[PDB]
Amino acid sequence: SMSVKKPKRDDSKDLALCSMILTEMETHEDAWPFLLPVNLKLVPGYKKVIKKPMDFSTIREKLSSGQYPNLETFALDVRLVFDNCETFNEDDSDIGRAGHNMRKYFEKKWTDTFK
């Protein structure tokens, strides 16, 4: 509260560390469904069904241009990528599986880097 602060957690390496994690996600073999925005002209259903599209390139641009106020808003956009994937894709499809694997991969790196 006013004039009563928890001790300052060092957040000065967060930007660089989220970049590293994002690089690791971009270079994973199962990143391919997630590298670019879903083409809304060519994929029936996507536009109406997925209210907040997100992909790695868009996260990369947001990160690079100071559009994440902190590491939580960054993790929200990463998760949003996998939540959209689960909304639109059956678990037993190549994309469905890629989403589950990428999420697992993200979540481990997040814990090991920050928790």
Side-chain angles (χ1 to χ4, degrees), residues 1-7 9-12 14-114:
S1 79
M2 202 186 321
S3 315
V4 178
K5 285 304 164 321
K6 283 200 185 57
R9 192 204 156 254
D10 188 6
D11 65 342
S12 56
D14 288 358
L15 187 62
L17 293 161
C18 295
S19 186
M20 292 172 46
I21 291 165
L22 185 50
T23 292
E24 294 167 4
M25 281 197 305
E26 293 165 331
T27 62
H28 192 305
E29 66 163 298
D30 307 336
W32 56 271
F34 315 113
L35 294 174
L36 301 179
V38 166
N39 187 329
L40 292 184
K41 303 160 194 282
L42 301 189
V43 171
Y46 211 83
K47 191 168 205 295
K48 182 65 174 285
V49 168
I50 299 295
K51 300 313 171 169
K52 287 170 80 171
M54 188 54 50
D55 68 281
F56 298 167
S57 75
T58 295
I59 299 168
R60 172 68 72 195
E61 186 52 48
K62 287 183 66 169
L63 190 62
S64 294
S65 60
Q67 289 182 66
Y68 295 113
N70 55 57
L71 83 172
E72 307 305 336
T73 56
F74 168 78
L76 286 170
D77 266 0
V78 173
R79 289 164 186 153
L80 170 59
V81 173
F82 306 130
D83 298 346
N84 294 344
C85 187
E86 284 194 52
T87 298
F88 206 78
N89 298 271
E90 281 294 332
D91 298 342
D92 184 18
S93 59
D94 296 96
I95 292 171
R97 274 190 288 284
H100 297 290
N101 289 355
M102 288 305 302
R103 187 196 291 277
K104 188 77 169 187
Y105 193 76
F106 169 62
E107 290 307 353
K108 167 108 163 77
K109 305 282 186 173
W110 193 252
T111 291
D112 296 351
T113 299
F114 295 115

